[PDB]
Design a protein around this ligand. Structure first.
Ligand SMILES: [Ca+2]
Ligand SMILES: [Ca+2]
Length: 71
């Protein structure tokens, strides 16, 4: 709850460039690339796709967490 899950809630919240309240695949490639690491769009696009429960190109913090670790 507030033990540490908070940092996760933050990092992901700030991540949403368009502060839409969720996370899209386009933001990952741009932000990661902007951060200094240029990932692969094919992996990114596929990344969320697998970590998507609603199937709306948008995933909250958890739906993502379970992914962040898994490569
Ligand atoms: Ca988003
Ligand atoms: Ca989803």
């Amino acid at each position: 709850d507030t033990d540490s899950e908070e940092e996760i809630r933050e990092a992901f919240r700030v991540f949403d460039k368009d502060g839409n309240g969720y996370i899209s695949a386009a933001e990952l490639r741009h932000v990661m690339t902007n951060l200094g690491e240029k990932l692969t769009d094919e992996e990114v696009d596929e990344m969320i796709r697998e970590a998507d429960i609603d199937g709306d190109g948008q995933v909250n913090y958890e739906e993502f967490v379970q992914m962040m670790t898994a490569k």
